[PDB]
Amino acid sequence: KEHPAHERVLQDLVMDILRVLSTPDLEVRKKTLQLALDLVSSRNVEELVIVLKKEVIKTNNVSEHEDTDKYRQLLVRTLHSCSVRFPDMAANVIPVLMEFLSDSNEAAAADVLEFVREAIQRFDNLRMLIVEKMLEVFHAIKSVKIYRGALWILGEYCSTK
């Protein structure tokens, strides 16, 4: 990689390779994700993102996660980073949705992590929708996690007086 003359393309070929991952082995996959993250100057991105979303669908599937779960968390990390740099998009909205589906803490933690972050980040607009989304999600749901969720959000508050 310390061929820091680091050509565009090469980074790009990864996905192809990556496709192969669907024949799992997380551990390998995991190595990939880290590896993967790196190349992206917040670009070859979309095609990827899309692909990620594909992954995401794929991730849904019917699953009996045991290994891939892990991956997900990781992915999200990997993913997280990018965003920091980037301006990101709808894809993201989808996580929010996605997250609603889900049922385990670690994600909530991420989410929360996001809570924090976003709290810092504020360009805002999205949030509001999402807040709406959430409103649904929320209405649509119960749990400690949620319960907790409410608290912060509540804490947060703005309009629709």
Added chain:
Amino acid sequence: HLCEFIEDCEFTVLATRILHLLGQEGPKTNNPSKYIRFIYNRVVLEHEEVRAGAVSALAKFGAQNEEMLPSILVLLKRCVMDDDNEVRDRATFYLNVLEQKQKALNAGYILN
């Protein structure tokens, strides 16, 4: 004995009860450093909740102050402070609450 043992004799539930009681008692029985010493410990434990009691007990206490407390009482809330969002909030809020009344007044209303 209670303090120590309970610490390493566990059960959160006990703590609730005792907390509540202790909550009232404070500086009428002095021994500040120790008592502080304890109090810190009680908090030490995780649980936003476990942590929380030491502050609440404190309100009757703080207000009264003891063999050294008012100046310092003021200093302490500052020295000990926390994030963890709603745990953050607890610190912030108590503060914020604190922020909101002349602390002398503050003590009077809340206490009752």
